CSV table of C-alpha atoms in Angstrom, one decimal:
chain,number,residue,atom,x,y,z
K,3,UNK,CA,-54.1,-31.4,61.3
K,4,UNK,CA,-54.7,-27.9,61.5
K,5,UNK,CA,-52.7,-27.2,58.2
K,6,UNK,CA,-55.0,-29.1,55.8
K,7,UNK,CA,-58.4,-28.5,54.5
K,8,UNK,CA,-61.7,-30.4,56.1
K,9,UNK,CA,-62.3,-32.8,53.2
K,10,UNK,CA,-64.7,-34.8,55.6
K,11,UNK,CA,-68.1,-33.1,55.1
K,12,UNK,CA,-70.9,-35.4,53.7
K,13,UNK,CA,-70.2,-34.5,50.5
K,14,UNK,CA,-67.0,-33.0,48.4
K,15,UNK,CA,-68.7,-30.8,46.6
K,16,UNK,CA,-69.6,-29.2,42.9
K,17,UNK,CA,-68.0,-30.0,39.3
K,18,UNK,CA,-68.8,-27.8,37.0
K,19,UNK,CA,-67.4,-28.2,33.6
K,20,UNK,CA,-68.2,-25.8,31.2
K,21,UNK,CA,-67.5,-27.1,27.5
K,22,UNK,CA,-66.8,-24.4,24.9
K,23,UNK,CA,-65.7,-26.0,21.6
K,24,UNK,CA,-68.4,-24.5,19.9
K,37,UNK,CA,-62.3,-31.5,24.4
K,38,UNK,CA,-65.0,-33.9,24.6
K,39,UNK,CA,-62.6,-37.0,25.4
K,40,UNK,CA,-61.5,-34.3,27.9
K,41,UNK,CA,-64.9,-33.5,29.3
K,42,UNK,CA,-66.0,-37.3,29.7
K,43,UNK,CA,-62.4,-37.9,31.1
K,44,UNK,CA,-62.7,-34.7,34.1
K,45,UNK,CA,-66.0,-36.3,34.6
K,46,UNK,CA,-65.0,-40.2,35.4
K,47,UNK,CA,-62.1,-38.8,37.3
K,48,UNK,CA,-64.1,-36.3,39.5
K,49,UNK,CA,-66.9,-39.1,39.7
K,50,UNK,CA,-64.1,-40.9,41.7
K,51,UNK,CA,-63.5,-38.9,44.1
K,52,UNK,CA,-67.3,-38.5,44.8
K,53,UNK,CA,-67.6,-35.1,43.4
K,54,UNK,CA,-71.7,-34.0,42.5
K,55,UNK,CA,-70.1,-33.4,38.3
K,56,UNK,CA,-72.3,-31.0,35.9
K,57,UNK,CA,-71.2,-31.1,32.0
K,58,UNK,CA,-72.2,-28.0,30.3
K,59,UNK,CA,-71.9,-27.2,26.7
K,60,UNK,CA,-71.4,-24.6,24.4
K,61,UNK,CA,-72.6,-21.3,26.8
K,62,UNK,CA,-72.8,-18.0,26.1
K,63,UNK,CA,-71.3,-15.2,28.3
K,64,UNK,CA,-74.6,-14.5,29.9
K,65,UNK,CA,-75.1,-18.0,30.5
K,66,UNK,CA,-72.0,-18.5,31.9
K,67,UNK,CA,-72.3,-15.6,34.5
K,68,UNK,CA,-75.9,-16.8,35.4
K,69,UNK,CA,-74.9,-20.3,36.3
K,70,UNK,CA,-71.7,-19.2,38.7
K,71,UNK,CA,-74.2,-17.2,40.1
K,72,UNK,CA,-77.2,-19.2,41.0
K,73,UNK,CA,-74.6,-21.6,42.1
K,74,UNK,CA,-73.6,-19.5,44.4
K,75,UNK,CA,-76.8,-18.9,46.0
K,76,UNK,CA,-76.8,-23.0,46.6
K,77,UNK,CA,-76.4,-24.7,49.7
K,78,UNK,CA,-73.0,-25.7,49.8
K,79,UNK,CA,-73.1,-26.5,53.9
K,80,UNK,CA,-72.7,-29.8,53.1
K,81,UNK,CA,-70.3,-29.7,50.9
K,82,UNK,CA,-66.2,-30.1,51.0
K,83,UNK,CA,-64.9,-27.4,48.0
K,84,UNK,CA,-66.0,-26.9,44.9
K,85,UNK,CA,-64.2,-26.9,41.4
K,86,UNK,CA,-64.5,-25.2,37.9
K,87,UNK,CA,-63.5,-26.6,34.9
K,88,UNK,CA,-63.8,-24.2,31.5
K,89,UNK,CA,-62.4,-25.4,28.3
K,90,UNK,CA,-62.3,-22.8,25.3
K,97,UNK,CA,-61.9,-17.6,29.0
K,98,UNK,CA,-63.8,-17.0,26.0
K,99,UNK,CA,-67.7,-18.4,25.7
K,100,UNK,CA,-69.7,-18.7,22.6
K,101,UNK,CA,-71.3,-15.4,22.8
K,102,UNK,CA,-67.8,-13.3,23.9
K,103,UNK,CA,-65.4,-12.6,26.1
K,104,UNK,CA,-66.1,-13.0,29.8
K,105,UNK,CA,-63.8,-11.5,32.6
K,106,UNK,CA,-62.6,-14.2,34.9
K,107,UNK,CA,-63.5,-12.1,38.0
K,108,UNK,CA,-67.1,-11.5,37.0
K,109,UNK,CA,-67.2,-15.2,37.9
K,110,UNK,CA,-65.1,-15.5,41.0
K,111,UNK,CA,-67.2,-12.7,42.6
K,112,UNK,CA,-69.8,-15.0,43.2
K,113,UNK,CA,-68.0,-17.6,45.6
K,114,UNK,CA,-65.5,-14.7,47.1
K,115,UNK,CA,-65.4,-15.3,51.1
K,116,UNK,CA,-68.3,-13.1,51.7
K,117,UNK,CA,-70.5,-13.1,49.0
K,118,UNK,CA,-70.5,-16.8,49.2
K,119,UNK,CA,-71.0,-17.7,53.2
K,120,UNK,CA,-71.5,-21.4,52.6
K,121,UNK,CA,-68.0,-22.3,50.7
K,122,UNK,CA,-66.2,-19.3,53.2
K,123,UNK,CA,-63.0,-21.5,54.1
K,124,UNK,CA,-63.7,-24.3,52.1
K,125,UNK,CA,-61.3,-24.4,48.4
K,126,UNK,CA,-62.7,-23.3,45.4
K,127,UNK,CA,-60.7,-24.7,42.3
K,128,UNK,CA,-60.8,-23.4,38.7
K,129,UNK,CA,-59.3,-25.8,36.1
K,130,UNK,CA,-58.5,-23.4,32.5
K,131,UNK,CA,-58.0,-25.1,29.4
K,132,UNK,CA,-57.5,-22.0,27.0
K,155,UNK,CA,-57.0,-8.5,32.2
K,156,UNK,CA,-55.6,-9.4,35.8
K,157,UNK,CA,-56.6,-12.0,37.8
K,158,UNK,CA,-58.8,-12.1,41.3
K,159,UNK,CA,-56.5,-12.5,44.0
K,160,UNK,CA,-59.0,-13.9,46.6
K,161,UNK,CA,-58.5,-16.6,50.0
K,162,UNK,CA,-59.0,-19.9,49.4
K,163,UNK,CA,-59.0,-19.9,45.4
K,164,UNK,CA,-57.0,-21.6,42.6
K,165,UNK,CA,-56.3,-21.2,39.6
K,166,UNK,CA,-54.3,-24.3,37.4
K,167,UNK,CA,-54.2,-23.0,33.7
K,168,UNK,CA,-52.7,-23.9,30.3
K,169,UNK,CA,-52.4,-22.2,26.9
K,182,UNK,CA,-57.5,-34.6,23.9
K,183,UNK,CA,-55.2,-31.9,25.7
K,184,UNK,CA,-52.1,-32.9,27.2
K,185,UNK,CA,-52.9,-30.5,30.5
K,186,UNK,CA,-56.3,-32.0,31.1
K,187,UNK,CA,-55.2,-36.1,30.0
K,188,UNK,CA,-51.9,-36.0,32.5
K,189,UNK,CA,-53.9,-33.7,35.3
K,190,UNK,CA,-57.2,-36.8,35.3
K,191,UNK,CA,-53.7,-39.4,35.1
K,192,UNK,CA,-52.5,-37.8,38.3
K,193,UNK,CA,-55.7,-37.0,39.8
K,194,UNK,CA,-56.7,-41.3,39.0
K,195,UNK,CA,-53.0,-42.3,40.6
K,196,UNK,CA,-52.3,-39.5,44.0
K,197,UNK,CA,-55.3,-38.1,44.9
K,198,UNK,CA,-55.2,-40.5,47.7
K,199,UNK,CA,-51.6,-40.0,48.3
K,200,UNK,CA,-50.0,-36.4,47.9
K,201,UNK,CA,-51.3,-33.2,48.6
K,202,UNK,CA,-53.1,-31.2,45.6
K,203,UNK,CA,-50.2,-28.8,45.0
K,204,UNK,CA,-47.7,-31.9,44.4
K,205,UNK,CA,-50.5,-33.3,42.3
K,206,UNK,CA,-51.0,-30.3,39.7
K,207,UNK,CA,-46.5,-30.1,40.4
K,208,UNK,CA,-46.2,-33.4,38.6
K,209,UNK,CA,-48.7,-32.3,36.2
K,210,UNK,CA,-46.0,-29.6,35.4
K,211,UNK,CA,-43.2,-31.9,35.1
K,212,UNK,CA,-45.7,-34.4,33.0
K,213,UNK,CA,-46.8,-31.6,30.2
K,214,UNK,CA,-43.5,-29.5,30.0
K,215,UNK,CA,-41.8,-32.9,29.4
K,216,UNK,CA,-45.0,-33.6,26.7
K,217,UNK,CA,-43.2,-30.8,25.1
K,218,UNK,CA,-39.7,-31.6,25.1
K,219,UNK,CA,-40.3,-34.5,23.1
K,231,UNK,CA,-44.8,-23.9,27.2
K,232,UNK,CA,-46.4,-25.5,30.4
K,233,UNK,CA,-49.5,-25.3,33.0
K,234,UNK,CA,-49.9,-22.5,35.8
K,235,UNK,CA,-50.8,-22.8,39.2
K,236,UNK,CA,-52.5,-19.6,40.7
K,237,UNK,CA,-52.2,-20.8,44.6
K,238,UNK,CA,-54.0,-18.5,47.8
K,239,UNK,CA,-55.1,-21.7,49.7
K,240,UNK,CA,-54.5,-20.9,53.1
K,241,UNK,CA,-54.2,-24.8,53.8
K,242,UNK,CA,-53.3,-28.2,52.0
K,243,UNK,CA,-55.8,-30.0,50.0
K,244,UNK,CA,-56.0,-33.3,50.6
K,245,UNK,CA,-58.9,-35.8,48.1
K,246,UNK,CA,-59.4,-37.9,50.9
K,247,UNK,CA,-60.1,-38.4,54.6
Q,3,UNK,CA,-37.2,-40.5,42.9
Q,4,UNK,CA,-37.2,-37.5,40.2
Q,5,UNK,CA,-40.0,-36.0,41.9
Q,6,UNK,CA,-37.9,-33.4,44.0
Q,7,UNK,CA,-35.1,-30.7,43.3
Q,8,UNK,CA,-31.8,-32.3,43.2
Q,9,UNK,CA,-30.4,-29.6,46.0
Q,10,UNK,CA,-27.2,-31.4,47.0
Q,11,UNK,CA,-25.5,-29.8,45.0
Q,12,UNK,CA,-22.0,-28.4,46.8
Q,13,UNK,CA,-23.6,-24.9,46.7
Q,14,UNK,CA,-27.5,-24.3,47.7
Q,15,UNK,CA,-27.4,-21.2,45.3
Q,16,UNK,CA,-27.6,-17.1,45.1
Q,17,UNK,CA,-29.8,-15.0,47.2
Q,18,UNK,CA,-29.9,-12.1,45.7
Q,19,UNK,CA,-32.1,-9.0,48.0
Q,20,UNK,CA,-32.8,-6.0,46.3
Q,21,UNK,CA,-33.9,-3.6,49.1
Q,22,UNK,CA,-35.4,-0.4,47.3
Q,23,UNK,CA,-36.6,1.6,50.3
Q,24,UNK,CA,-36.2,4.9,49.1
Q,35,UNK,CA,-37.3,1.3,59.4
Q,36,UNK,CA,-39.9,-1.4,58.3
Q,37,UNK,CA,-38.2,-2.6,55.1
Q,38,UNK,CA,-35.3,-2.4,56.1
Q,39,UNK,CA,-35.8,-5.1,59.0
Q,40,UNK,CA,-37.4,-7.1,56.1
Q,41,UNK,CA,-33.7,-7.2,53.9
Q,42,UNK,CA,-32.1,-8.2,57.5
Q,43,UNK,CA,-34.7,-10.4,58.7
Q,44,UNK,CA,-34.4,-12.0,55.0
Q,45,UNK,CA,-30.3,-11.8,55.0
Q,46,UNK,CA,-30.2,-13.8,58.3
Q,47,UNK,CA,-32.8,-16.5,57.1
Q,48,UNK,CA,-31.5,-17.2,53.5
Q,49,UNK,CA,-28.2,-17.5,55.6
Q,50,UNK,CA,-28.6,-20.2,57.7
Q,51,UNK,CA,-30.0,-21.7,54.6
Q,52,UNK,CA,-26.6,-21.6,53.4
Q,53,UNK,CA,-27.4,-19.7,50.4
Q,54,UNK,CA,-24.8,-16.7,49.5
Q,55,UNK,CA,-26.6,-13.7,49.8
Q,56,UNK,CA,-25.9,-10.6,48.0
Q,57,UNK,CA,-27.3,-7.0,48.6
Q,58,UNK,CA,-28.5,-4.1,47.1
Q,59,UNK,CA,-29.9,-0.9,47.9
Q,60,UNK,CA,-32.1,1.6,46.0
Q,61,UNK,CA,-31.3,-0.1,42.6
Q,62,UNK,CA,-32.7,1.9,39.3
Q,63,UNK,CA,-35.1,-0.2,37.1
Q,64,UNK,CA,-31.7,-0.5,34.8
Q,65,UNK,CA,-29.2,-1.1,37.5
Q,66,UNK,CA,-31.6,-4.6,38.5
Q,67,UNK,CA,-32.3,-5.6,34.7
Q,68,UNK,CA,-28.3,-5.8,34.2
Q,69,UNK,CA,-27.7,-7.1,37.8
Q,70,UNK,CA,-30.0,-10.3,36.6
Q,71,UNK,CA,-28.4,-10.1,33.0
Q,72,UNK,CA,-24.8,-10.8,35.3
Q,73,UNK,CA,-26.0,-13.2,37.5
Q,74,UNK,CA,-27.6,-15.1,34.7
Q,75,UNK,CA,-24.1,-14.9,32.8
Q,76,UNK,CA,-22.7,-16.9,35.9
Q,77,UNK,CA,-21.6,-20.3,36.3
Q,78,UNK,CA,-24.5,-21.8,38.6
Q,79,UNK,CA,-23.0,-25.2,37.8
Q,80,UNK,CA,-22.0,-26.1,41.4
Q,81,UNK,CA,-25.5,-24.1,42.4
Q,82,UNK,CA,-28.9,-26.0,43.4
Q,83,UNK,CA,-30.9,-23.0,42.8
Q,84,UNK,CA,-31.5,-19.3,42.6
Q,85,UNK,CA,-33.3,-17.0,45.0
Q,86,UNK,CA,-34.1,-13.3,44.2
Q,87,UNK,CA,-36.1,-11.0,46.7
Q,88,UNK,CA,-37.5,-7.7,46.0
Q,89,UNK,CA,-38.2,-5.1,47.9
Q,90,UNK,CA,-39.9,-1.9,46.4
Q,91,UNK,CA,-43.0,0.4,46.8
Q,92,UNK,CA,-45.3,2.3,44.6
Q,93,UNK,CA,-48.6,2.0,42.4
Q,94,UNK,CA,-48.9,0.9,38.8
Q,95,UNK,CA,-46.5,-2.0,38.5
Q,96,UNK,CA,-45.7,-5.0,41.2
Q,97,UNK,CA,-41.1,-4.8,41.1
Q,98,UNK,CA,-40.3,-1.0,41.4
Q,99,UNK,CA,-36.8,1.1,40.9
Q,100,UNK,CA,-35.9,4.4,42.2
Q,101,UNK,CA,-36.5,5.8,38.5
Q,102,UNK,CA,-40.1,3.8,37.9
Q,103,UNK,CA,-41.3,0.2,37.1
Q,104,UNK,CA,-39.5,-3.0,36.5
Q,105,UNK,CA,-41.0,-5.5,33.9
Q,106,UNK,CA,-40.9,-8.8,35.3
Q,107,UNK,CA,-40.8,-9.9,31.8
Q,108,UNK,CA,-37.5,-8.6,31.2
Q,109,UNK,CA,-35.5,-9.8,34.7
Q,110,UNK,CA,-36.8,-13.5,34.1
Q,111,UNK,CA,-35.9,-13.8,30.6
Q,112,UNK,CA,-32.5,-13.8,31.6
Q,113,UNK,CA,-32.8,-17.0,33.1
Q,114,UNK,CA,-34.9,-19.0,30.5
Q,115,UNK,CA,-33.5,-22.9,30.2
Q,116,UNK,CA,-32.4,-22.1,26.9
Q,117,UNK,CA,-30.2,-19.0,28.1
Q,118,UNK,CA,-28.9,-20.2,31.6
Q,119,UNK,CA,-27.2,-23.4,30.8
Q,120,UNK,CA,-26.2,-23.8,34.6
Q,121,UNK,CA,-30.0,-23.3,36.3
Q,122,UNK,CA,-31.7,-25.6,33.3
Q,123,UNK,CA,-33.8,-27.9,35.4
Q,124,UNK,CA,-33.3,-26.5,38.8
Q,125,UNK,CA,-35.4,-23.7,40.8
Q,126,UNK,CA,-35.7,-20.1,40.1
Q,127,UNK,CA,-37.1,-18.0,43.2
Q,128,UNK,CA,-38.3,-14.6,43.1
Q,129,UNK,CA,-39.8,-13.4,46.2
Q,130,UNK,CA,-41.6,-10.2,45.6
Q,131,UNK,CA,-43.0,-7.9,48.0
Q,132,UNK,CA,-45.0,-4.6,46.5
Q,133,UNK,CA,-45.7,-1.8,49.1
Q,134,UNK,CA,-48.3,0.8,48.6
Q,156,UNK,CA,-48.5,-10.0,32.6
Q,157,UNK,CA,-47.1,-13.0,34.3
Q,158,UNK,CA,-44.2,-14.7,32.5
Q,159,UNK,CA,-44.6,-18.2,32.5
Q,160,UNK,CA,-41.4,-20.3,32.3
Q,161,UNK,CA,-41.0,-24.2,33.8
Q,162,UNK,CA,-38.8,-24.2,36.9
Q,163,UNK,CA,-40.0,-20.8,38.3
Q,164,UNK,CA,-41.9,-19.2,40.9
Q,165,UNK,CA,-43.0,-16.0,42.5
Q,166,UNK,CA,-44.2,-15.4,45.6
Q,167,UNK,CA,-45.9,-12.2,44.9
Q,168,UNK,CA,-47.9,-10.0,48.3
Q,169,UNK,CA,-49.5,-6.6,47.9
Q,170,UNK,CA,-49.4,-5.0,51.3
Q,171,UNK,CA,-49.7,-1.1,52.3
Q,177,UNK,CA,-42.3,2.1,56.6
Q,178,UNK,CA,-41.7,2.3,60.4
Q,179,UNK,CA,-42.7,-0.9,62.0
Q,180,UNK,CA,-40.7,-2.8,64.5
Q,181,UNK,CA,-41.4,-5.6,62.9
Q,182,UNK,CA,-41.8,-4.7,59.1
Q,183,UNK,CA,-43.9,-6.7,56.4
Q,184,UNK,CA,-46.4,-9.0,57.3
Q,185,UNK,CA,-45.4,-11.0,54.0
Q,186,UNK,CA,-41.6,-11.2,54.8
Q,187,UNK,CA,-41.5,-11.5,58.3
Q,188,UNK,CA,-44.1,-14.5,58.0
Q,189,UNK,CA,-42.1,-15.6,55.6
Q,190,UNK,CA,-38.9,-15.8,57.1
Q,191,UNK,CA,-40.6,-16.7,60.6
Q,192,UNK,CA,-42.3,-20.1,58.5
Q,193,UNK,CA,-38.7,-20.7,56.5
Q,194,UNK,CA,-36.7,-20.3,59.7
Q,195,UNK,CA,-39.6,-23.3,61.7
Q,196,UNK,CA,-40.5,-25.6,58.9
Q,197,UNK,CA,-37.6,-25.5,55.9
Q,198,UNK,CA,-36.6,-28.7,57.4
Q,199,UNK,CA,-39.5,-30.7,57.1
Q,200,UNK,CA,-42.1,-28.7,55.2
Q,201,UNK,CA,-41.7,-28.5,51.2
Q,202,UNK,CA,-41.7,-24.8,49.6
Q,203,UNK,CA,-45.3,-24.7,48.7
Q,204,UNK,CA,-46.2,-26.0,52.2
Q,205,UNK,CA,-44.6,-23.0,54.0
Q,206,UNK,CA,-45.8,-20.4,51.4
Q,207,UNK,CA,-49.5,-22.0,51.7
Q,208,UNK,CA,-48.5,-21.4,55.8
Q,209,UNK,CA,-47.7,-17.9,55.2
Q,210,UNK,CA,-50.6,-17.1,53.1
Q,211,UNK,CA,-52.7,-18.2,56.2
Q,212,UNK,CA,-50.9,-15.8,58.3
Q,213,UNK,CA,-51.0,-13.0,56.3
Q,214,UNK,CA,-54.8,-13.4,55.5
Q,215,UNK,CA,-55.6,-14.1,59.5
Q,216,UNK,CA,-53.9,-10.4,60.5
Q,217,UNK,CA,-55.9,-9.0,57.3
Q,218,UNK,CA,-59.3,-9.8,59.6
Q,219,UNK,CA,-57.7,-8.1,62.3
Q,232,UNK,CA,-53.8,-11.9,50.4
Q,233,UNK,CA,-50.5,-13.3,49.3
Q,234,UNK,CA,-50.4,-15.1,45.5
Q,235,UNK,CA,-48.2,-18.0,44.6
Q,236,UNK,CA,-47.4,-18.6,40.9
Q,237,UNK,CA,-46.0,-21.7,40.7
Q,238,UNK,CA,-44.6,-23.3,37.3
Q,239,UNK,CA,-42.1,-25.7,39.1
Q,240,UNK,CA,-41.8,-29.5,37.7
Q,241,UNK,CA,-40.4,-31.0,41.0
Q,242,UNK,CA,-40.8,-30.4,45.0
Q,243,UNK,CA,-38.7,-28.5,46.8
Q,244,UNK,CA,-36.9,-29.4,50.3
Q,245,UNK,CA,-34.2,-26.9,51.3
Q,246,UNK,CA,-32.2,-30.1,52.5
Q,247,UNK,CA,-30.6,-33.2,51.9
C-alpha cells in the first residue's frame, strides 16, 4: 500500500478555485463536487495577477500538516489584470519551499512558456464547459472506485467524444496513485 | 467494458528505437529491445538518425497498414540542449513526427495507443490516443539511464498486472528517489492500457 498516496490525514485538504470570467455553473459545480469528498473549497472571483500570486503564496505559508493534498482550480492562465506565468505559482508549494504539502499531491485543474516539471504535481488542462461538467460527473461517480489517473482518462474519452458528435491534458509527476478515499 | 485498449489484436504493434548516441545509451536501446520483446511487440532499430531521416521514418511507418496492430511504440534516444528529440544534424520538432499519426491520417491506429518514449540527455502537441513519457536526465554507465532502465526494470515486473500509467507513476518514484541521492507524463489517452489479454 506503498504505491498510493496517504489520503487518511484529518483532513483532505485545500480547493481553491479561482474564477476569471471577468463558468459559474462550473464554479458552483467544482464546489458541490469537491464539498463531497470533504475538501476545505474557496471560490475566488475575478483576481488580478497580483492577487493571484499573493493568495498561492500566503497559502503556502498555511499549515497544511493536517491536511491530505491540495488542488487548484483556474478558469479563464490569464487574470484580470494580465498574464501570469504558471510557475510563479507552483513555486510556492514546490517540495521545499512548501515543507507541509512535501509528498502529499498538489493538483491544478486549467480551464483556458514551459511548464514546472516538479514531484508530486499535476496538471489536467483544456483549451458550462464540457472539461469541467464530465470531470465533477466522474469525480461524483469513481472517486470512490478508480484511481485519479483513470478518473481524469475517462474524462478524456468523455470530452473528445463531446467533440465527435481537441481534448483535456494530463501533466502527471505523482510519484504514487491518488486514491479520494480511505 | 470500453474503458481499456482493445490490445488483442493478432499483433501487439511497432516498437520503433531510435538510438542517437553519437556505453550508457547504448545498454538503454538493448535493455529497451529485450523488454518491448517479450512484450511481443516487433521492434525495429535505428542508429544515429538525422532530424530528416526520423521525420520520414515516422512519415513510413504511418503510411503502414497497423490494421492487425494494437498499438504503436516509438523510443527515442538523443542528447543535447535547446530541444527535448535530437538528430545528428540538430533538433526534432515533435510537432512534425506526431502529425503523421493524427486519427484523421492513420486510418489503422484511429482509436488505439500511440507511445513515444522520450529520453533527452544533457510546444506539446496534443492529439487523443497519445502519450509521452518525456525525462530530462544529464555515456559510460554499466547500467545507463535512470529513466530507461527503471522503465524497462517496472515494464519487465508489473506489465502483467499494473496499467501503463501505474508503472510510469512507479518509475517516476524511482527516478526522483535516486535524484535525493523528475520524469513528466503527458497523457491524452481515452482508455487504460494493459499490455495483455
Amino acid at each position: 500500500a506503498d504505491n498510493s498516496y496517504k489520503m487518511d490525514y484529518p483532513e483532505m485538504g485545500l480547493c481553491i478555485i479561482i474564477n476569471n470570467k471577468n463558468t459559474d455553473v462550473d464554479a458552483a459545480n467544482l464546489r458541490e463536487t469537491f464539498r463531497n469528498l470533504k475538501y476545505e473549497v474557496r471560490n475566488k472571483n475575478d483576481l488580478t495577477r497580483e492577487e493571484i500570486v499573493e493568495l498561492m503564496r500566503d497559502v503556502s505559508k498555511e499549515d497544511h500538516s493536517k491536511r491530505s493534498s491540495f488542488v487548484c482550480v483556474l478558469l479563464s492562465i490569464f487574470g484580470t489584470n494580465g498574464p501570469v506565468d504558471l510557475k510563479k505559482i507552483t513555486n510556492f508549494f514546490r517540495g521545499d519551499r512548501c515543507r507541509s504539502l512535501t509528498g502529499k499531491p498538489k493538483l491544478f485543474i486549467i480551464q483556458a512558456h514551459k511548464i514546472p516539471v516538479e514531484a508530486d504535481f499535476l496538471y489536467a488542462y483544456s483549451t458550462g464547459s464540457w472539461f469541467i461538467q464530465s470531470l465533477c460527473a466522474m469525480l461524483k461517480q469513481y472517486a470512490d472506485k478508480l484511481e485519479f489517473m483513470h478518473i481524469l482518462t475517462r474524462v478524456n474519452r468523455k470530452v473528445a467524444t463531446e467533440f465527435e458528435s481537441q481534448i483535456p491534458c494530463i501533466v502527471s509527476m505523482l510519484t504514487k496513485e491518488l486514491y479520494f478515499y480511505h
